[model samples]
Target: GAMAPSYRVKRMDIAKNDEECVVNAANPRGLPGDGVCKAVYKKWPESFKNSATPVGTAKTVMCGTYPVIHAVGPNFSNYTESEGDRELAAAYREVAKEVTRLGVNSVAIPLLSTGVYSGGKDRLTQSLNHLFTAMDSTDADVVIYCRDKEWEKKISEAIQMRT
Candidate 1:
């Protein structure tokens, strides 16, 4: 059997990740938005290649060092919680798929769809649950990077429920 991927939550900027790969929350048009996407876009604009990456899918760009997987996390404004949940899971799964294809030992990822993307905190616990399940199938160690304290609170709570 394949070993379960190791999962850890840390407070840090995705751009600061020194891991093998980082998953950036990207727009479908392959444009950068606020938060992690902006950080990644400013840092490596030229590497961004594919356009029209639909929600729940991803495109990869090899930066100078680690690769960046631009994942289009679903916009919650358009869908109900249940519908959004499917896209959210698919997005993480796509990230993990990209990481596996690259065979990176570790990958850092943000909580997709949770910020201005409008994955309300009310659904965070469920999001986290879905995230873990999707990423757990990967070979790389997973770092669940949280940008601030508010997300950290919910991440901690969701993790405790797992224990």
Candidate 2:
């Protein structure tokens, strides 16, 4: 198994990322807590917040520019490490499925729940691993956005390890 040529790792902000669509690490209530969620919510349609997206699921909200796919990733603080890992994979899988369903040519996604949600470096690796794995069957150009250069390097190393 190999990563698709369209898959990419970049040091950038998902909020300002230019792509056909972008993913938001969201909560069930779809609250614009902070980080990527807040950034994506800056333009999120108000009415879309009425529903709560279950963990390991995704919901799409059409935006002025690119559609925001609100992906409810596991909040590691609420579950055991293993459960978090499994849900994290499902979260990414749902996002990949959403991307395919939306038929977007390109998308930018962040490492879900790895920030304030406390999914440590290990989780970061898992996030990348799962996203790339899910994207293997996707034809769209996928970019994994990491604001921290250190994390960006980590992603590079992870990619190399898989190769």
Candidate 3:
């Protein structure tokens, strides 16, 4: 099969650099591991604003030196409505745009709208597609990094179809 154009898609289990900016679907407080934000703060003291909102989405906090943007969707474990899905997708796009505006080069995103917030694979794929499409048109290098290989595959497939 021929590769898709527009942007390149690469898969990896976990990023080697914990300091690298990432796009996470997890909550701000429970940022997986020691938390990317804390890791970044430990490395670069003044680069980030320890626990500060990234302009909009007062819900999320900016951490890390590489500009790790957290794109958290409503927990789907309890919310079954599709409205949450739509909002999540919109949030992802907004976050992407804001991150780019911040002069960041690369952005790492996770499989949003798929975790406890929403279990629908279709919606997850759609949201990711929309996000990648928006990122491709921009000069920023978007990296969709997932916690597991399955997520990486899912996002890769979504980007392929969209491109």
Candidate 4:
């Protein structure tokens, strides 16, 4: 169960990068909400506005030459029950699968559902652990990019521990 892929893992900024295909989490509504989706929608309008997922599960759009994987999950409401961990995990795998299909070597992703709609910090950690592990089988390079060093360090440890 500890077997991890021989691919790459990283912690850094996942935004507006030209070198990596980015994965932005969305809701079932097929619109850009919080997290990186909001920021991506703002700057990468070329890749978001016209995009709409009929399945509301996962969608991919191109920003310049890079492709952004749009994954649908939960949202930030005053009260909720969906932990969104499973959805995020599935999204991670979907993104990785897409990356492999595209024959790209690198792609960036966020800690999905960790923000406004999160269950808690501990839950977020647990969720990421599972997500990182799920990514273990994905052959392409997976970058867990974010904005905190403490979190980056923690995620790095988690990624290492997955193997």
TM-score per prediction, in order, is 0.87, 0.87, 0.62, 0.75
18-105 per-residue lDDT for model 3 (tens digits): 3235554445344342343344345433433343332113132444335545554555554546666565656666665666567655
Model 3 spans > 4 angstroms off: 1-10, 13-20, 28-64, 119-123, 133-136, 147-151
lDDT of each: 0.79, 0.78, 0.51, 0.62
Candidate order (lDDT) = 1, 2, 4, 3
RMSD of 4: 4.2
Query: Candidate 1, residues 73-93: lDDT per residue as tens digits?
Result: 788888787878889889888
How far residue 1's Cα lies from its native spot in candidate 3, in Å, is 29
Which stretches of model 1 miss by more than 4 angstroms?
Answer: 1-5, 119-121, 160-163
RMSD in order of candidates = 2.5, 3.1, 5.7, 4.2
Model 3 clashing residue pairs (backbone):
23-108, 75-117, 76-116, 76-117, 76-118, 77-116
The model with the greatest lDDT is 1
Where is model 4 more than 4 Å wrong at Cα? 1-12, 16-18, 54-56, 76-83
Error of 2 at 69 (Å): 0.4
Q: Would you list the rank order by TM-score, best first?
A: 2, 1, 4, 3
Q: Residue 2, candidate 1: how far off, in angstroms?
A: 12
Decide which is better by lDDT, 2 or 3: 2
